[PDB]
Amino acid sequence: LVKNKCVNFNFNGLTGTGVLTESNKKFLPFQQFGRDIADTTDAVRDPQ
Amino acid sequence: VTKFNGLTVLPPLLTDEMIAQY
């Protein structure tokens, strides 16, 4: 995994495009990947 | 008074400080 650079990313099947940065927001223990009000992905947890 | 899928927003030519100055 490479962050801070515009890369093609895919985690378990999300298969999106974007640059990944370390995020302040905290997930729930079970919740895997977040989303925004516009149904666009905004935060993902690395499975590893 | 109170992400990108191709669409974008452009900043106004007169920013809020310049509009306040006007």
Side-chain angles (χ1 to χ4, degrees):
Chain A
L1 163 153
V2 202
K3 50 194 97 48
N4 293 336
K5 180 174 311 304
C6 163
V7 309
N8 210 0
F9 83 101
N10 180 15
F11 296 153
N12 298 1
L14 309 203
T15 181
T17 294
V19 50
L20 295 87
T21 80
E22 182 168 355
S23 151
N24 191 22
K25 80 169 56 185
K26 311 207 319 201
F27 277 64
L28 287 181
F30 76 130
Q31 259 165 356
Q32 276 282 62
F33 62 103
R35 194 170 292 183
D36 185 62
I37 189 146
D39 303 344
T40 61
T41 321
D42 64 353
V44 189
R45 163 199 265 92
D46 167 35
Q48 297 200 12
Chain B
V1 182
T2 179
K3 177 64 70 67
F4 286 0
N5 69 10
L7 70 89
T8 181
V9 86
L10 313 186
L13 167 60
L14 297 172
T15 36
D16 273 294
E17 200 282 339
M18 327 184 31
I19 296 171
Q21 203 163 358
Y22 261 140

Coordinates of all heavy atoms in Angstrom, one line a residue:
Chain A
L1 N 0.8 -1.2 0.0 CA 0.0 0.0 0.0 C 0.9 1.2 0.0 O 1.9 1.3 0.7 CB -1.0 0.0 1.2 CG -1.7 1.3 1.7 CD1 -3.0 0.9 2.4 CD2 -0.8 2.1 2.6
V2 N 0.5 2.2 -0.8 CA 1.2 3.5 -0.9 C 0.2 4.6 -0.7 O -0.8 4.7 -1.4 CB 1.9 3.7 -2.3 CG1 3.1 4.7 -2.1 CG2 2.5 2.3 -2.8
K3 N 0.5 5.5 0.2 CA -0.4 6.6 0.5 C 0.2 7.9 0.1 O 1.3 8.0 -0.4 CB -0.7 6.7 2.1 CG 0.6 6.6 2.9 CD 0.2 6.3 4.4 CE 0.3 4.8 4.7 NZ 1.6 4.3 4.2
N4 N -0.6 9.0 0.2 CA -0.2 10.4 -0.1 C 0.1 10.6 -1.6 O 0.6 11.6 -2.0 CB 1.0 10.8 0.7 CG 0.7 11.0 2.2 OD1 -0.5 11.2 2.6 ND2 1.7 10.9 3.1
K5 N -0.2 9.6 -2.4 CA 0.1 9.7 -3.9 C -1.2 9.1 -4.6 O -1.8 8.2 -4.1 CB 1.3 8.9 -4.3 CG 1.6 8.9 -5.8 CD 2.9 8.2 -6.1 CE 4.0 8.7 -5.2 NZ 4.2 10.2 -5.2
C6 N -1.5 9.8 -5.7 CA -2.7 9.3 -6.5 C -2.4 8.0 -7.1 O -1.6 7.8 -8.0 CB -3.0 10.4 -7.6 SG -4.1 9.7 -8.9
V7 N -3.1 6.9 -6.5 CA -2.9 5.6 -6.9 C -4.2 4.9 -7.2 O -5.3 5.4 -6.7 CB -2.1 4.7 -5.9 CG1 -0.8 5.5 -5.5 CG2 -2.9 4.5 -4.7
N8 N -4.2 3.8 -7.9 CA -5.4 3.0 -8.1 C -5.5 1.9 -7.0 O -4.6 1.0 -6.9 CB -5.3 2.3 -9.5 CG -6.7 2.1 -10.0 OD1 -7.7 2.4 -9.4 ND2 -6.8 1.5 -11.2
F9 N -6.5 2.0 -6.1 CA -6.6 1.2 -4.9 C -7.8 0.3 -5.0 O -8.8 0.6 -5.6 CB -6.7 2.1 -3.7 CG -8.1 2.6 -3.4 CD1 -8.9 1.9 -2.4 CD2 -8.7 3.6 -4.1 CE1 -10.2 2.4 -2.2 CE2 -9.9 4.0 -3.9 CZ -10.7 3.4 -2.9
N10 N -7.7 -0.9 -4.3 CA -8.7 -1.9 -4.3 C -8.6 -2.6 -3.0 O -7.6 -3.4 -2.8 CB -8.7 -2.8 -5.5 CG -9.8 -3.8 -5.4 OD1 -10.8 -3.7 -4.7 ND2 -9.7 -4.9 -6.3
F11 N -9.5 -2.5 -2.1 CA -9.5 -3.2 -0.8 C -10.8 -4.1 -0.7 O -11.9 -3.7 -0.5 CB -9.6 -2.2 0.4 CG -8.3 -1.4 0.5 CD1 -8.4 -0.1 1.1 CD2 -7.1 -1.8 0.0 CE1 -7.3 0.7 1.2 CE2 -6.0 -1.0 0.1 CZ -6.1 0.2 0.7
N12 N -10.5 -5.4 -0.9 CA -11.5 -6.5 -0.8 C -12.6 -6.4 -1.8 O -13.6 -7.1 -1.8 CB -12.1 -6.5 0.6 CG -11.1 -6.8 1.7 OD1 -9.9 -7.0 1.4 ND2 -11.5 -6.9 3.0
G13 N -12.5 -5.4 -2.8 CA -13.5 -5.3 -3.8 C -14.1 -3.9 -4.0 O -15.0 -3.7 -4.8
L14 N -13.6 -2.9 -3.2 CA -14.0 -1.5 -3.4 C -13.6 -0.9 -4.8 O -14.3 -0.2 -5.4 CB -13.6 -0.6 -2.3 CG -13.8 -1.1 -0.8 CD1 -13.9 0.0 0.1 CD2 -15.2 -1.9 -0.7
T15 N -12.4 -1.3 -5.2 CA -11.8 -1.0 -6.5 C -12.1 0.4 -7.0 O -12.8 0.6 -8.0 CB -12.3 -2.1 -7.6 OG1 -11.7 -1.8 -8.8 CG2 -13.8 -2.2 -7.7
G16 N -11.7 1.4 -6.2 CA -11.8 2.8 -6.5 C -10.5 3.4 -7.0 O -9.5 2.7 -7.2
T17 N -10.5 4.7 -7.2 CA -9.4 5.5 -7.6 C -9.3 6.7 -6.7 O -10.3 7.5 -6.6 CB -9.5 5.9 -9.1 OG1 -9.4 4.7 -9.9 CG2 -8.3 6.8 -9.4
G18 N -8.1 7.0 -6.1 CA -7.9 8.1 -5.3 C -6.6 8.0 -4.5 O -5.9 7.0 -4.5
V19 N -6.3 9.1 -3.8 CA -5.1 9.2 -3.0 C -5.5 9.1 -1.6 O -6.5 9.7 -1.1 CB -4.4 10.6 -3.2 CG1 -5.4 11.7 -3.2 CG2 -3.3 10.7 -2.2
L20 N -4.8 8.2 -0.9 CA -5.2 7.8 0.5 C -4.4 8.6 1.5 O -3.1 8.6 1.4 CB -5.0 6.3 0.7 CG -5.9 5.3 -0.1 CD1 -5.3 5.0 -1.5 CD2 -6.2 4.0 0.7
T21 N -5.0 9.1 2.5 CA -4.4 9.8 3.6 C -4.8 9.2 4.9 O -5.9 8.7 5.1 CB -4.7 11.3 3.6 OG1 -6.0 11.6 4.2 CG2 -4.7 11.9 2.1
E22 N -3.9 9.4 5.9 CA -4.3 9.0 7.3 C -5.4 9.9 7.8 O -5.4 11.1 7.7 CB -3.1 9.1 8.2 CG -3.3 8.6 9.6 CD -2.1 8.5 10.4 OE1 -1.0 8.6 9.8 OE2 -2.1 8.2 11.6
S23 N -6.4 9.2 8.4 CA -7.7 9.9 8.8 C -7.8 10.0 10.3 O -7.5 9.0 11.0 CB -8.9 9.2 8.1 OG -10.0 9.4 8.9
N24 N -8.4 11.1 10.7 CA -8.7 11.3 12.2 C -9.9 10.5 12.6 O -10.0 10.1 13.8 CB -8.8 12.8 12.5 CG -8.8 13.0 14.0 OD1 -8.3 12.2 14.8 ND2 -9.4 14.2 14.3
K25 N -10.9 10.3 11.7 CA -12.2 9.7 12.1 C -11.9 8.3 12.5 O -11.0 7.6 12.1 CB -13.2 9.8 11.0 CG -13.0 8.7 9.9 CD -14.2 8.7 9.0 CE -14.4 10.1 8.3 NZ -15.7 10.1 7.5
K26 N -12.8 7.8 13.4 CA -12.7 6.5 14.0 C -13.9 5.6 13.6 O -15.1 6.1 13.7 CB -12.6 6.5 15.5 CG -11.6 7.5 16.0 CD -11.0 7.1 17.4 CE -12.1 6.6 18.3 NZ -11.7 6.7 19.8
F27 N -13.7 4.4 13.2 CA -14.7 3.5 12.8 C -15.3 2.7 14.1 O -14.7 2.9 15.2 CB -14.2 2.4 11.8 CG -14.2 2.9 10.4 CD1 -13.4 4.0 10.0 CD2 -15.0 2.3 9.5 CE1 -13.4 4.4 8.7 CE2 -15.0 2.7 8.1 CZ -14.2 3.8 7.8
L28 N -16.3 2.0 13.8 CA -16.8 1.0 14.8 C -16.0 -0.3 14.7 O -15.5 -0.6 13.6 CB -18.3 0.8 14.7 CG -19.2 1.9 15.2 CD1 -20.6 1.5 15.0 CD2 -18.8 2.2 16.6
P29 N -15.9 -1.1 15.7 CA -15.1 -2.3 15.6 C -15.5 -3.3 14.5 O -14.6 -3.9 13.9 CB -15.3 -3.0 17.0 CG -16.4 -2.2 17.7 CD -16.3 -0.9 17.1
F30 N -16.8 -3.3 14.2 CA -17.2 -4.2 13.1 C -17.2 -3.5 11.8 O -17.0 -4.1 10.7 CB -18.6 -4.8 13.4 CG -19.7 -3.8 13.3 CD1 -20.9 -4.2 12.5 CD2 -19.7 -2.6 13.8 CE1 -21.9 -3.3 12.4 CE2 -20.8 -1.7 13.7 CZ -21.9 -2.1 12.9
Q31 N -17.5 -2.2 11.8 CA -17.7 -1.4 10.5 C -16.4 -1.4 9.7 O -15.3 -1.1 10.3 CB -18.2 0.0 10.8 CG -19.7 0.2 10.6 CD -20.1 1.5 11.3 OE1 -19.4 2.2 12.0 NE2 -21.4 1.8 11.1
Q32 N -16.5 -1.7 8.5 CA -15.3 -1.9 7.6 C -14.9 -0.6 6.8 O -13.9 -0.1 7.0 CB -15.5 -3.0 6.6 CG -15.2 -4.4 7.2 CD -13.7 -4.7 7.3 OE1 -13.0 -4.0 8.0 NE2 -13.3 -5.8 6.6
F33 N -15.8 -0.1 6.0 CA -15.6 1.0 5.1 C -16.7 2.0 5.2 O -17.9 1.7 5.2 CB -15.3 0.6 3.7 CG -16.5 0.0 3.0 CD1 -17.3 0.7 2.2 CD2 -16.9 -1.3 3.3 CE1 -18.4 0.1 1.6 CE2 -17.9 -1.9 2.7 CZ -18.7 -1.2 1.8
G34 N -16.3 3.3 5.3 CA -17.3 4.4 5.5 C -17.8 4.9 4.2 O -17.6 4.3 3.1
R35 N -18.6 6.0 4.3 CA -19.3 6.6 3.2 C -19.7 8.0 3.5 O -19.8 8.3 4.7 CB -20.5 5.7 2.7 CG -21.0 6.0 1.3 CD -22.0 5.0 0.9 NE -21.4 3.7 0.6 CZ -22.0 2.6 0.2 NH1 -23.3 2.7 -0.1 NH2 -21.3 1.5 0.0
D36 N -20.0 8.8 2.5 CA -20.5 10.1 2.7 C -22.0 10.2 2.3 O -22.6 9.2 1.8 CB -19.7 11.1 1.8 CG -20.1 12.6 2.0 OD1 -19.9 13.1 3.1 OD2 -20.5 13.2 1.0
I37 N -22.6 11.4 2.6 CA -24.0 11.5 2.4 C -24.4 11.4 0.9 O -25.5 10.9 0.6 CB -24.5 12.9 2.9 CG1 -26.0 13.0 2.9 CG2 -23.8 14.0 2.1 CD1 -26.6 13.8 4.0
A38 N -23.4 11.6 0.0 CA -23.6 11.5 -1.4 C -23.3 10.1 -1.9 O -23.2 9.9 -3.2 CB -22.8 12.5 -2.2
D39 N -23.3 9.1 -1.1 CA -23.0 7.7 -1.4 C -21.6 7.5 -1.9 O -21.4 6.4 -2.5 CB -24.0 7.1 -2.3 CG -25.5 7.2 -1.8 OD1 -25.6 7.4 -0.6 OD2 -26.4 7.0 -2.6
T40 N -20.7 8.4 -1.8 CA -19.3 8.3 -2.3 C -18.4 7.8 -1.1 O -18.5 8.4 0.0 CB -18.8 9.6 -2.9 OG1 -18.8 10.6 -1.9 CG2 -19.7 10.0 -4.0
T41 N -17.6 6.9 -1.4 CA -16.7 6.3 -0.4 C -15.7 7.4 0.1 O -15.2 8.2 -0.7 CB -15.9 5.2 -1.0 OG1 -16.7 4.4 -1.8 CG2 -15.3 4.3 0.2
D42 N -15.5 7.5 1.4 CA -14.7 8.6 2.0 C -13.7 8.1 3.0 O -12.8 8.9 3.4 CB -15.6 9.7 2.6 CG -16.4 9.1 3.8 OD1 -16.3 7.9 4.1 OD2 -17.0 9.9 4.5
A43 N -13.7 6.8 3.4 CA -12.8 6.3 4.4 C -12.9 4.8 4.3 O -14.0 4.2 4.3 CB -13.1 6.8 5.8
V44 N -11.7 4.1 4.3 CA -11.6 2.7 4.2 C -10.6 2.2 5.2 O -9.6 2.8 5.5 CB -11.3 2.1 2.8 CG1 -11.5 0.6 2.8 CG2 -12.2 2.8 1.8
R45 N -10.9 1.1 5.9 CA -10.0 0.4 6.8 C -9.2 -0.7 6.0 O -9.9 -1.5 5.4 CB -10.7 -0.2 8.0 CG -9.9 -1.2 8.8 CD -10.8 -2.1 9.7 NE -10.8 -1.5 11.0 CZ -11.7 -0.7 11.5 NH1 -12.7 -0.2 10.7 NH2 -11.7 -0.3 12.8
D46 N -7.9 -0.7 6.2 CA -7.1 -1.8 5.5 C -7.4 -3.1 6.2 O -7.3 -3.2 7.4 CB -5.6 -1.4 5.6 CG -4.7 -2.6 5.2 OD1 -5.1 -3.4 4.3 OD2 -3.7 -2.7 5.8
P47 N -7.8 -4.1 5.4 CA -8.0 -5.5 6.0 C -6.8 -6.0 6.8 O -6.9 -6.7 7.8 CB -8.4 -6.3 4.9 CG -8.0 -5.6 3.6 CD -8.1 -4.1 4.0
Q48 N -5.6 -5.8 6.2 CA -4.4 -6.3 6.9 C -4.1 -5.7 8.2 O -3.9 -6.3 9.2 CB -3.2 -6.2 6.0 CG -3.2 -7.0 4.7 CD -1.9 -7.2 4.0 OE1 -0.9 -6.9 4.6 NE2 -1.9 -7.6 2.8
Chain B
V1 N -26.2 31.2 8.1 CA -26.3 30.4 6.8 C -25.3 29.3 6.9 O -24.1 29.5 7.3 CB -26.0 31.3 5.6 CG1 -26.1 30.5 4.3 CG2 -27.0 32.5 5.6
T2 N -25.7 28.1 6.4 CA -24.8 26.9 6.4 C -24.5 26.6 4.9 O -23.6 25.8 4.6 CB -25.5 25.7 7.0 OG1 -24.6 24.6 6.9 CG2 -26.8 25.4 6.4
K3 N -16.5 12.8 -3.1 CA -16.9 14.2 -3.1 C -17.1 14.8 -4.5 O -18.1 15.4 -4.7 CB -15.8 15.0 -2.3 CG -16.1 16.5 -2.2 CD -17.4 16.8 -1.5 CE -17.3 16.5 0.0 NZ -16.3 17.4 0.7
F4 N -16.1 14.5 -5.3 CA -16.1 15.0 -6.7 C -16.3 13.8 -7.6 O -15.5 12.9 -7.6 CB -14.8 15.8 -7.0 CG -14.8 17.2 -6.4 CD1 -15.8 17.6 -5.6 CD2 -13.7 18.0 -6.6 CE1 -15.8 18.9 -5.0 CE2 -13.7 19.3 -6.0 CZ -14.7 19.7 -5.2
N5 N -17.3 13.9 -8.5 CA -17.5 12.9 -9.5 C -17.4 13.4 -10.9 O -18.0 12.9 -11.9 CB -18.9 12.2 -9.3 CG -20.0 13.1 -9.6 OD1 -19.9 14.2 -10.1 ND2 -21.2 12.7 -9.2
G6 N -16.6 14.5 -11.1 CA -16.5 15.2 -12.4 C -16.9 16.7 -12.2 O -16.3 17.6 -12.8
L7 N -17.9 16.9 -11.4 CA -18.3 18.3 -11.1 C -17.3 19.0 -10.3 O -16.5 18.4 -9.5 CB -19.7 18.3 -10.4 CG -19.8 17.8 -9.0 CD1 -19.6 18.9 -7.9 CD2 -21.1 17.1 -8.7
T8 N -17.3 20.3 -10.4 CA -16.4 21.2 -9.6 C -17.0 22.5 -9.4 O -18.0 22.9 -10.1 CB -15.0 21.3 -10.3 OG1 -14.2 22.1 -9.5 CG2 -15.2 22.0 -11.6
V9 N -16.6 23.2 -8.3 CA -17.1 24.5 -8.0 C -16.0 25.6 -8.3 O -14.8 25.3 -8.1 CB -17.6 24.6 -6.6 CG1 -16.4 24.9 -5.6 CG2 -18.7 25.6 -6.4
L10 N -16.4 26.7 -8.8 CA -15.3 27.7 -9.0 C -15.4 28.8 -8.0 O -16.5 29.2 -7.6 CB -15.4 28.3 -10.4 CG -15.6 27.3 -11.6 CD1 -15.5 28.1 -12.9 CD2 -14.5 26.2 -11.5
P11 N -14.2 29.3 -7.5 CA -14.3 30.4 -6.5 C -14.8 31.6 -7.1 O -14.6 31.9 -8.3 CB -12.8 30.5 -6.1 CG -12.0 30.0 -7.3 CD -12.9 28.9 -7.8
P12 N -15.5 32.5 -6.4 CA -16.0 33.7 -6.9 C -14.8 34.7 -7.2 O -13.8 34.6 -6.5 CB -16.9 34.3 -5.8 CG -16.4 33.7 -4.6 CD -15.9 32.3 -5.0
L13 N -15.0 35.5 -8.2 CA -13.9 36.5 -8.6 C -13.7 37.4 -7.4 O -12.5 37.6 -7.0 CB -14.3 37.3 -9.8 CG -13.5 38.5 -10.1 CD1 -12.0 38.1 -10.3 CD2 -14.0 39.2 -11.3
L14 N -14.7 38.0 -6.8 CA -14.6 38.8 -5.6 C -14.7 37.9 -4.4 O -15.8 37.4 -4.1 CB -15.7 39.9 -5.6 CG -15.6 41.0 -6.7 CD1 -16.9 41.8 -6.6 CD2 -14.4 41.8 -6.6
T15 N -13.6 37.7 -3.7 CA -13.7 36.8 -2.5 C -14.5 37.6 -1.4 O -14.8 38.8 -1.5 CB -12.3 36.4 -2.0 OG1 -11.4 37.5 -2.2 CG2 -11.8 35.2 -2.7
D16 N -14.8 36.9 -0.3 CA -15.6 37.4 0.7 C -15.0 38.7 1.4 O -15.8 39.6 1.7 CB -15.9 36.3 1.8 CG -17.1 35.5 1.4 OD1 -18.3 36.0 1.4 OD2 -16.9 34.3 1.2
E17 N -13.7 38.7 1.5 CA -13.1 39.9 2.1 C -13.3 41.1 1.1 O -13.5 42.2 1.6 CB -11.6 39.6 2.4 CG -11.0 40.6 3.4 CD -10.7 42.0 2.8 OE1 -10.5 42.0 1.6 OE2 -10.5 43.0 3.6
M18 N -13.1 40.9 -0.2 CA -13.3 42.0 -1.1 C -14.7 42.4 -1.2 O -15.0 43.6 -1.4 CB -12.7 41.5 -2.5 CG -11.5 40.6 -2.4 SD -10.8 40.2 -4.0 CE -11.1 41.6 -4.9
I19 N -15.7 41.5 -1.2 CA -17.1 41.8 -1.1 C -17.4 42.6 0.1 O -18.1 43.6 0.1 CB -18.0 40.6 -1.3 CG1 -17.8 39.9 -2.6 CG2 -19.4 41.0 -1.1 CD1 -18.4 38.6 -2.7
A20 N -16.8 42.2 1.3 CA -17.0 43.0 2.5 C -16.4 44.4 2.4 O -16.9 45.3 2.9 CB -16.3 42.2 3.7
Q21 N -15.2 44.5 1.7 CA -14.6 45.8 1.5 C -15.5 46.7 0.6 O -15.7 47.9 0.8 CB -13.2 45.7 0.9 CG -12.3 46.9 1.1 CD -10.9 46.6 0.8 OE1 -10.5 45.4 0.5 NE2 -10.0 47.6 1.0
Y22 N -16.1 46.1 -0.5 CA -17.0 46.8 -1.3 C -18.2 47.3 -0.6 O -18.6 48.5 -0.7 CB -17.4 46.0 -2.5 CG -16.7 46.2 -3.8 CD1 -16.3 45.2 -4.6 CD2 -16.3 47.5 -4.2 CE1 -15.5 45.4 -5.8 CE2 -15.6 47.8 -5.3 CZ -15.2 46.7 -6.1 OH -14.5 47.0 -7.3

